[PDB]
């Protein structure tokens, strides 16, 4: 549990500064503005987007904030759920 | 171990004139191979201009320098004649002994490389001769003479049945009394040149002193003239649809070399093995192929016709040269 | 050779109740149109007999 | 064989040599005919007899630049379809190229670009001259290089899922699902996508593809 | 009139399709003898012979046209100046198309235009003379050679209007040498003195001229170039302003220098470059930077404003390999220490790339990033790799009835069927002596590089035999430093060896005191090992380090139930610093030492001692004959003694070295050193002895001092080195100078 | 490359050398426009290293040994008066004292001073190869006008002495348009193109006036590198006639007939007006020629191999030789009441005489 291993690091650079810029009514293009394209988007057949900011350096503990937004069709931002930490 | 640098400029003239650099480094035991034991250490340089006449042939030509130095050669009459040529009062009855000598020299040489095809050749010749002079001067003021040649002729304008001829020739005294008797020698036995006697097996074997009689171990000698007619044929068996680029071959050898300066007079009691008469005889069968590894050859021989101990090496294989 | 034979026949999966799976798009095969031609060692490999 | 110019009746004794496989002579006196008459009734033929002849000398670089110069001098020659099944054919064939056909250990991991070409290639053949009586195995040939094309994305999909990368795995077999949904590569996929999900905790992803998954996998 | 037929002939290098479709007049409309003239210019357009005639005489028109050889092939008589290539190329592109038309006046036309590129290329004098021949089926070739002299030296350079430094300086630097003439050199020589210049710090510096003169004989160039330097310009604090990320503190510690220094041109190059390159490092791949001089006549006083955007942060969306072919995509792709899906570290990137270069296994390395189409924020890297194909395998075997078997072998190949492994074997039997070696390594057994390896060997002189088998664990346990332990076997039996001192009070220290006569020895153990070993690859160089120390440290112990315990330490070490802060110009110091001893009351078995001597440990003396010399017990009555070289228990060597890729050749490689190095043996107690060396302590310490060469070779990077032992003693063998591969 | 064979002749003239002077160091194998020049029985002569000497036309005594010091002692000597002026083509240009060969100042010209220094009513012209006039005052050195002609990239030594008439100046230029330019305020006056050109992406875009014109009765003659001998109307620019019949430099006219030397290396001379010629020399082709002198009433000249010609004034007769000098000449020779001047490469100065 010490032999060493590259830091992970994972999904769009998300910050506290960065994110109260989402606010509910935005246009999902300018939605790709304020955040910068999305990493993951659901193939599923629905219009979100998973941002994901997540690092893992050496061993230290796991960190992740998550932030799931529902576009309806046509493409307006209709909710914010954001996870501050990784469930656990 | 082995090492040499090599580093050419096709143009030092724009004809085409070459100019190759050739600088080595060779650590030698004679009892790594059946050659009587001694150990040669040598280092030189030799630089060479490589230039054509006409079509596919060259020219060469150069300067060399080199070095060698000698150690604990077995108490033999071969090796203590090379000393007395040098004037080195020798050791005979310790063969705690050394010899170094710094020497220098030209060489000159030709190719006729007419050749069709790097493998599976069917209609093509070559011929490869070098000649290597000492130059007034040099510790050692020997020559030499190096020919090897290769033809191909087809029998069939399928190119199937084609024939490989080779001979091998060479000779080398030098000027004066400074023989080259035991740092430059020619060999016979191996894979390449006859095949089916043991590698440089041909040739004198030495005659001990008493130390601290006739032995049946080789010196090499100083004339050669090694041949080969080999007869090549597509191969009865095999997956010719895939196996078109394995080559089956039936092979007749001969083998000679001999020492102009064995004195049949101080040797009275010893085999005359200054006659040239006592060729080595072997014939038998081939296999070369190439794979995506590397290149294989298999072949047998029965090497039906030799002298007393004359270790036969029936079956050789290897891969990669 | 023959080793492109044998390759596992494709099976297009099966969109679960009320979702649906990506619009896909690039690397698909046309049909093979009811060709009637050779396969495999049986394929004619040499050129045209004449233009 | 000397470069001597031969009158043009050369076609017949080079036609015997090509049919009785003598592929250097072949390949040489082809390239010879084609230099010494480029453009005569014998062009297009010759052509085509050089690239199958360089086909069978296995010397594959070459039959690349033959069929690059024969689509760039004749964009529609009436056996054209010919030309684009050896191009697609000569690409797989430089794929399958490794030492490894003795061992027997798989290269599906190995580079795909030349199998993209070739799919690429035997595609718009398919797609243009369906009814030649090539299509058949062109298509033998598709369905091939797009299972090959999916087991490379699936390798690196389980590389990413082992150093953890869950971000990687789940876009590149998404990738997976937008482009190959049909092969068994991406049916040994989808429980990667699962644990990449379960690792990053989206469970709002997890259980639908686990739902995917399981109204699938026999 | 009208016309309801058209005659034609011939049609050889045009069809009649074509001339229908060409003409503006068609079959069955109205024309005259100027739409028939128009007729005949429509198909001069096409191509046509020159030569043609028209005939009316009833409903049809007649019309024939005069064919003869055109189309063309190129050969020239010899090019000596000129490369045949560039000239084949330069013929197309000048218009000799192979197999276009050509006629007299292209004849004409082409040897104007070899004229005008000979003169291009310097040589001013030359000539051009063309010919062609027919060939059959209206062909032509065509043949054309060369007259030309000598191409124009370069004389006097002339710079004029300078006042600071003078000629020789700025001729001195550039690569013109008062030689031939090259217009492009022209122009780089051009920005070497602006660059001079500007870094000197005369920042207005202008060059308002430039022209070059054939003298009448057109023998040679005069280069002329007109000076302005403007006054004594002085630097002033840099100042930033613009869309920065927020990282303010790091820019201007990295852009802030003391003011009132002299202003220098590659000084803010650096600067600007280092700025973006900051940038690049936080994940701004493609930053809009930007420097303007403020220029102030006020005490020449010049402050930078240097305006940087750094755009989007780019995330690298895919990471493709292309030549990766023989490798799987795995072990490149572990290798590769930036992730998929992160923001795009940039010398994270270059990282990996040093780490695939690292590996070694790969003859070039080179790093493309690109943006994906029609998208503004997602970046693409992909690598481009050659293969070094290391698998060097040779094979032999014989097979005869008085000679029943011999052998070689040798099989090392890394990755050899891709993955990852190295698997190397070795074999051989001579009459005289049988060996076997076959080792794996898996190494990267998991993926955080917990390397897993096998070695095992098997060895047998007709006395010596031994056999064994050693495995070790790798695991990396920081950027830099590596770590391994290990565990293995290995058995001996000697028999019928030389009395030798040393072996004998090794033997008696088993408490098996040994038969002290007659060569009648026979011993057999079996030993098995504990391996611990530590690791230091803080070099930063691909081939030849320059400023970085490795070090490198080895552990035996035999505490599990051994035949025999002890334990031995190894400690390597390779220092390098730099002329100051110029990397280019290295000195190192290159240092060993080498401990091994006695356990459980006995002593360290001699087959483990150290061996000093040769291009592997010390510079200047034979390999392996510096460790203490051998005595032997009296046979074909005192204790006898001999010069041969046996290993000692303890180990020291320290040598200095200088490495200089000196250019006394364009640079486009040696060194010279100092060196040292000592052998001896512990228990070797001189109280039993008397005439005899100081073998208890290391007071012999022997040096040699020479030079060395390095070169690079196919195989391995090779080095050569020379010496003259001047401190050396007694029985010291040595020669001057000897080889050594890695 | 082909030579001329050196022809032979018997020496008719039987000339000799009167004097010569090892001065000091030559100008090398630089092609340099660096003729000395006579001035009441003392004649002046350079060095490229920067070593000048006055000596005396009729011994050879020198007086100076001034080095002004490289320097690059270029451009020639002329003398007018008291003044010895002087380029360099360290764009500097030196006057010198007569009498003592004191300096009298040094003034700076823009770039390299090529062209020979030209006396004429208080200026000194001296076309430096930036192609810019410029007249220096004879009295103080300060640059009084300037003009800028522009320059094709690749020319010829734009040597193109100007020449003085009427007031006004004319002067070559590397692009190949003459200009004439009043010498109060060098205001140009009038431009002509002296011939077709640019049948090449740069070197038969050579067009060079490098000669020095000359000026008769209101006639201006001529000459380019690779155009023709031409005439001209002083007044008005406009040309006149044509003489496509060599072309390359240093044309001389005396007696209503014109000489000059081909680009090919061979002399002739040109009827009174139109361009046909009377006689033409042969078999001195591609070996350097130098400006001819016509003397005393013999047409000289020298070659490149070491010797002097000596042709007939009115026909094209070769009757002498052999006045051998060591390594031969790269510069003009001068000419002189009843004497002749030469110079050769190694510096060393000779006088002909019969």
């Given at each position: 549990?010490?032999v060493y ?8 650079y998300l910050?506290?500064?960065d994110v109260?810029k989402?606010?509910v009514?935005?246009t999902?293009?300018?939605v790709?503005?304020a955040?910068?394209?999305?990493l993951?988007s659901d193939?599923?057949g629905?219009?979100?987007?998973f941002?994901?900011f997540?690092?893992?350096?050496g061993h230290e ?19 914010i ?8 | 171990?082995y090492?040499?640098?090599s580093?050419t400029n096709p143009?030092?003239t724009?004809?085409?004139v070459?100019?190759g650099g050739?600088?080595?480094?060779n650590?030698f ?5 059946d ?5 040669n250490?040598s280092?030189?340089?030799?630089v060479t ?11 060469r030509?150069?300067?060399?320098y080199?070095h ?16 007395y040529?040098?004037g ?11 010899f170094?000598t ?8 030709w190719?006729?490389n007419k050749?069709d095809?790097?493998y599976?050749?069917t209609?093509?010749?070559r011929?490869?001769?070098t000649?290597?002079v000492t130059?007034?001067?040099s510790?050692?003021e ?7 040649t290769?033809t ?5 304008d399928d ?7 080779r001979t ?15 740092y430059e ?5 191996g894979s390449?040149?006859?095949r ?7 040739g ?16 090499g ?9 080999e007869?090549?044929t597509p ?6 649809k895939?196996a078109?680029?394995?080559?089956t ?5 001969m083998?000679?070399v001999?020492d102009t ?7 009275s009691?010893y ?6 008469s ?20 298999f ?8 002298y007393?101990?004359?270790?036969a090496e ?8 | 050779?023959?080793?492109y034979?044998?390759?596992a ?7 679960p109740?009320?979702?649906?799976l990506p619009?896909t798009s690039?690397?698909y095969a ?13 394929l004619?490999?040499?050129p045209?007999?004449?233009? | ?7 043009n009746?050369?076609?017949?004794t ?12 072949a390949?040489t006196?082809?390239?010879a005919?084609?230099?010494?008459y ?16 360089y086909?069978?000398n296995?010397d594959?670089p ?5 069929i ?8 529609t020659?009436?056996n054209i379809?010919?030309?684009?099944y050896?191009?697609?054919?000569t ?9 490894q ?19 690429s ?8 001259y369906?009814?030649?009586?090539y299509?058949?195995?062109?298509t ?6 797009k ?5 490379y ?9 082992e150093?953890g990368?869950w ?5 590149r ?12 590569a ?5 429980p990667?996508?699962?644990?990449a999900y379960?690792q990053?905790?989206m ?7 686990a739902?995917i998954?399981?109204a699938?996998?026999? | 009139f009208?016309?309801?037929?058209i005659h ?11 001339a229908?479709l060409?003409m503006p ?11 028939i003239?128009?007729?005949?210019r429509a198909?001069?357009?096409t191509?046509?012979?020159?030569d043609?005639?028209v005939?009316?005489?009833?409903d049809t ?5 005069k064919e ?19 000239l ?6 000048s218009?000799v198309?192979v197999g ?8 004409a036309?082409?040897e ?8 291009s290329?310097?040589?001013?004098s030359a000539s051009?003379?063309?010919?062609v021949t ?13 007259q ?5 030296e370069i ?7 300078n ?9 001195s630097?550039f690569?013109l040498?008062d030689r031939?003439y ?10 070497t003195?602006?660059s ?6 005369y ?17 040679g ?8 330097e ?14 920065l ?6 820019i ?5 220098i003391?003011?009132?220094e002299?202003?220098?041109?590659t ?7 280092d700025?973006?390159k900051?940038?690049?490092?936080y994940?701004?791949?493609?930053p809009?930077?930007?420097?303007m001089?403020?220029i102030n ?7 930078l404003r240097?305006n ?21 995509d ?15 570290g ?14 070694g ?8 990033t690109?943006?994906v ?8 890297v992909?690598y ?6 290391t ?10 009835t008085?000679?029943?078997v011999?052998?070689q072998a040798?099989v090392q ?14 074999g051989?039997?001579?009459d005289y002596?049988?060996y076997?070696?076959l ?7 998991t ?7 096998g ?5 047998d ?5 031994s056999?064994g088998?050693?495995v070790?664990?790798?695991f ?8 391994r332990?290990?565990l293995?076997?290995?058995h ?8 030798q001192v040393a072996?004998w ?5 088993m408490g ?7 060569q009648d020895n026979?011993?057999?153990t ?13 070099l930063?160089?691909?081939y ?15 505490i ?9 330490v190894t400690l390597?070490?390779?220092?390098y ?7 280019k ?5 290159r ?5 091994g001893d006695?356990?459980?009351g006995?002593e ?7 061996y000093?001597?040769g291009?592997?440990t ?14 032997y017990?009296?046979?074909?009555k005192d204790?006898?003694?001999?010069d041969?070289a046996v290993?000692?228990?303890?180990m020291?060597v ?11 050749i364009?640079d ?13 043996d ?7 002895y ?6 208890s302590?290391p ?6 001092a020479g ?7 196919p195989?391995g990077?090779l080095?050569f080195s020379?010496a003259?032992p001047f401190k050396?003693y007694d ?6 100078f000897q080889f050594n591969?890695? | 490359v082909?030579?001329?064979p050196?022809p032979?002749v018997?020496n008719?003239?039987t000339?000799?050398t009167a004097?010569?002077?090892s001065?000091?160091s030559?100008?090398?194998?630089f ?8 001035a ?6 350079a060095?490229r ?5 006055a000596?005396?036309?009729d011994?050879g005594?020198?007086?100076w040994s001034?080095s002004?010091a490289?320097?690059?002692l270029?451009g ?10 002087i380029?360099?083509?360290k ?8 009498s003592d060969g004191t300096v009298?100042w040094?003034t700076?010209?823009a ?7 030209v006396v004429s009513?208080?200026?000194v ?8 006039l410029?007249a220096?005052n004879?009295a ?10 522009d ?8 040597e ?10 004319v002067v070559?230029?590397?692009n190949?348009r ?8 060098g205001?140009?006056?009038?431009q002509?193109?002296?011939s077709?050109?640019?049948?090449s ?9 490098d ?7 209101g006639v201006?003659?001529?000459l380019?590198?690779?155009g023709?001998?031409?005439?001209l ?12 019949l060599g ?17 090919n ?17 042969s078999?001195?082709?591609?070996r ?5 002198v016509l ?6 000249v020298?070659?490149?191999?070491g010797y ?6 009115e026909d094209?007769r070769?009757?002498?030789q ?7 000449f790269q510069?003009?020779?001068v ?17 002909i005489?019969?």
């Open positions: 549990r010490v291993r590259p830091d992970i690091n994972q999904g769009n910050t506290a500064n109260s989402i606010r009514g935005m999902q293009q300018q790709a503005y955040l910068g394209t999305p993951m193939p599923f629905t219009n979100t987007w941002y994901v997540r690092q893992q350096p503990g796991v960190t992740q904030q998550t932030l799931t937004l529902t576009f309806n069709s046509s493409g307006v931002l209709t909710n759920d954001n996870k501050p930490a990784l469930s656990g | 171990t090492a040499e640098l580093v143009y030092f724009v004809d085409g070459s100019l050739r600088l080595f480094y650590d035991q004679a009892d790594d191979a050659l009587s034991d001694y150990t250490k280092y030189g340089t030799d201009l490589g230039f054509p006449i006409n079509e596919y042939n060259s020219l030509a150069g300067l060399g080199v060698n130095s000698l150690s604990n050669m077995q108490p033999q009459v071969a090796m203590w004649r090379y000393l040529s040098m080195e009062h020798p050791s005979t009855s310790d063969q705690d002994n050394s170094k710094d020497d220098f020299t030209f060489n000159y040489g190719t006729y050749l095809r790097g599976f050749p209609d093509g010749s011929v490869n001769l000649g290597k130059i007034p001067g510790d050692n020997y020559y030499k003479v190096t020919l090897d290769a191909y002729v087809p029998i069939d190119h199937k049945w084609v024939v490989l001829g091998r020739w060479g000779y080398g005294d030098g000027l004066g009394g400074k023989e080259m008797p035991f020698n020619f060999y016979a036995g390449s040149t006859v089916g006697f043991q590698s440089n097996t041909i004198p074997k030495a005659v001990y002193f008493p130390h601290q009689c006739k032995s049946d171990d080789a010196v000698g100083n004339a050669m003239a090694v041949a080969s007619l007869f090549i191969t009865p068996f095999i997956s010719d895939y078109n680029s394995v080559r071959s039936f092979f007749w050898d083998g000679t001999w300066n064995w004195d049949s007079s101080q040797y009691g085999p005359d093995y200054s006659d040239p006592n060729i080595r005889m072997s014939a038998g069968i081939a296999l070369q192929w190439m794979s995506p590894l590397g290149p294989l050859v072949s047998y021989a029965q090497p039906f016709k030799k007393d101990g004359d270790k029936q079956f050789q294989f290897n891969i990669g040269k | 050779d023959e080793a034979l044998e390759a026949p494709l099976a297009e999966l099966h969109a109740a009320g979702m649906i619009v690039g690397d046309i049909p093979v149109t009811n060709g009637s031609g050779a396969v495999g060692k049986a004619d490999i040499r045209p007999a004449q233009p | 064989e000397v470069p001597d110019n031969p009158p009746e050369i076609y017949a080079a036609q015997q040599k090509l049919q009785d496989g003598n592929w250097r002579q390949i006196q082809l390239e005919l084609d230099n010494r480029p453009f005569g009734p014998y062009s297009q033929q010759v052509q085509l007899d050089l690239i199958y002849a086909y069978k296995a594959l070459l039959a690349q630049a033959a690059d110069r024969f689509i760039r001098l004749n964009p020659h009436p379809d010919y030309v684009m050896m191009r697609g054919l690409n797989m064939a430089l794929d399958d190229s490794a030492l056909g003795f061992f027997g250990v798989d290269r599906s991991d190995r580079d795909p670009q030349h199998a993209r070409a070739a799919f290639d035997f595609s718009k053949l398919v797609r243009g369906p009814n030649s009586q299509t058949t195995d062109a033998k040939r598709l369905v091939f290089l299972d090959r094309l999916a087991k994305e699936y390798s690196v999909a389980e590389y990413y899922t150093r990368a971000v990687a795995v789940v876009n077999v998404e990738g997976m699902l937008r482009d190959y949904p049909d092969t068994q991406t049916r040994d996929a989808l990667l996508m699962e644990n379960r990053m905790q469970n709002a992803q997890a259980e639908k593809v739902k998954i399981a699938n996998s026999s | 009208v016309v309801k037929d034609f002939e011939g049609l050889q290098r045009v069809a009649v399709g074509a229908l060409s007049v068609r079959t069955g409309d109205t024309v005259n003898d100027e739409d003239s128009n007729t005949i198909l001069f357009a191509g046509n012979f020159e043609v005639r005939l009316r005489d009833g028109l007649l019309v024939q046209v003869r050889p055109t189309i063309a092939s190129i050969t020239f008589s010899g090019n000596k100046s000129v490369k045949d290539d560039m084949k190329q330069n013929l197309e592109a218009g198309r276009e038309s050509l006629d007299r006046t292209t004849i036309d082409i104007k235009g070899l004229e005008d590129f000979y003169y290329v310097g040589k001013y051009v003379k063309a010919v027919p060939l059959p089926r209206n062909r032509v070739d065509l043949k054309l050679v060369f030309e002299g000598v191409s124009a004389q006097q350079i002339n710079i004029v209007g006042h600071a430094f003078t000629t020789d300086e700025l001729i630097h690569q040498r031939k090259q217009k492009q050199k022209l122009a780089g020589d051009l920005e003195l602006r001079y210049y500007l870094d000197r710090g920042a207005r510096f202008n060059i308002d001229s430039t022209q070059v003169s054939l003298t009448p004989d057109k023998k160039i005069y280069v002329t170039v007109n000076i302005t403007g006054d004594q310009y002085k630097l002033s604090g840099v100042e930033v302003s613009g869309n990320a927020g990282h303010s503190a790091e201007e510690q990295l852009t802030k003391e003011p009132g002299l202003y220098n041109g000084k803010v190059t650096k600067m600007e470059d700025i973006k900051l940038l690049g490092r994940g701004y791949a493609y809009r930077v930007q420097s001089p403020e006549d006020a005490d020449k006083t010049v402050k240097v940087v955007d750094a755009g989007n942060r780019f995330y690298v969306r895919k990471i493709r390999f292309e030549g990766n072919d023989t490798s799987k795995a072990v490149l792709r572990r290798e590769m220490r930036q992730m998929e899906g992160a923001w795009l940039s010398d994270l990137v270059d990282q990996g790339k040093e780490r695939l270069n690292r590996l296994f790969f003859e070039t390395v080179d790093t493309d690109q943006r189409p029609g998208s503004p924020d997602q970046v693409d992909v481009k790799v050659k293969e070094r194909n698998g060097s395998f040779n094979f032999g075997i014989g097979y005869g008085e000679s029943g011999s052998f040798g190949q890394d990755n050899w069927l891709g993955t990852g492994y190295a698997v190397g074997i070795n051989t039997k001579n002596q049988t076997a070696e080792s794996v390594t898996n190494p990267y057994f993926v955080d590089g917990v390397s897993l390896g070695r095992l060997f098997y060895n002189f007709q006395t010596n035999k056999y088998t050693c070790t664990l790798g990396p346990i920081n950027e830099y430093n590596s770590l332990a290990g293995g076997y290995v001996n039996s000697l028999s019928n060896m030389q009395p072996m009070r090794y033997l008696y220290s098996e005191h040994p038969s002290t006569s007659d026979s011993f057999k079996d030993d098995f090992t504990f391996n611990y070993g530590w690791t230091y690859n803080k930063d160089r691909g030849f380090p320059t400023d970085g120390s490795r070090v490198n440290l080895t552990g035996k112990v035999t599990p139930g051994s035949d025999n315990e002890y334990y031995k390597d070490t390779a220092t610093v730099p002329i100051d802060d110029d990397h110009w290295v000195v190192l110091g240092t060993r030492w080498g401990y006695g356990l459980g006995k360290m078995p001699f087959y483990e001692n150290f000093a001597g291009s592997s010390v510079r200047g003396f034979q390999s392996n004959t510096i460790g203490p010399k051998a005595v017990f009296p046979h074909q204790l006898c003694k001999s041969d290993g000692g228990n303890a020291a320290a040598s200095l070295e200088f490495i200089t890729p000196t250019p006394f364009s486009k490689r040696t060194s010279f050193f100092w060196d040292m190095g000592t052998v001896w512990t228990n070797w107690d001189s109280s039993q008397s005439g005899y060396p100081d073998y302590d007071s012999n310490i022997r040096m040699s030079i060395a060469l390095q070169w690079m070779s195989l990077p080095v020379y003259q050396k029985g010291d063998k040595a020669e001057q591969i890695g | 082909k030579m001329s050196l032979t018997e008719q003239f000339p000799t004097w010569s002077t001065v000091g030559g100008i090398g194998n092609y340099s426009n660096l003729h000395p020049a006579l009441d029985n003392v004649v002046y002569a060095d290293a920067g070593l000048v000497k000596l005396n036309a011994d005594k020198e007086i001034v002004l490289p320097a690059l270029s020639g000597v002329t003398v007018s008066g008291g003044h010895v002026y380029g360099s083509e764009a500097q240009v030196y006057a010198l004292n007569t009298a040094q700076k010209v770039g390299e001073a090529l062209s020979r220094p009513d208080g200026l012209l001296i076309h430096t190869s930036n192609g810019q410029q220096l004879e103080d050195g300060a640059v009084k006008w300037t003009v800028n002609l320059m094709p990239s690749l020319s010829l030594r734009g193109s002495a100007p020449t003085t008439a009427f007031g006004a100046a070559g230029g590397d190949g003459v200009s004439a330019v009043l010498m109060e305020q205001q140009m006056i009038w002509q193109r002296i077709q050109a640019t049948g992406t740069e070197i038969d875009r050579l067009s060079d006036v000669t020095t014109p000359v000026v008769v009765n201006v003659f001529a380019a590198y690779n023709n001998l031409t005439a109307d002083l007044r008005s620019g406009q040309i006149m006639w044509k003489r496509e072309s390359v430099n240093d044309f001389i006219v005396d007696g209503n007939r014109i000489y000059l030397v081909d680009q290396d061979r002399v002739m001379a040109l009827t009174i007006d139109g361009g046909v010629t009377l006689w033409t020399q078999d001195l082709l591609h350097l020629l130098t400006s001819p003397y005393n009433g013999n047409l000289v020298g070659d490149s191999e002097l010609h000596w042709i007939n004034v094209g070769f009757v002498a052999q006045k051998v000098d060591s390594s031969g510069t003009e020779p000419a002189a009441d009843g004497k002749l001047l030469i110079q050769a490469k190694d510096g060393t100065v000779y006088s005489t019969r």
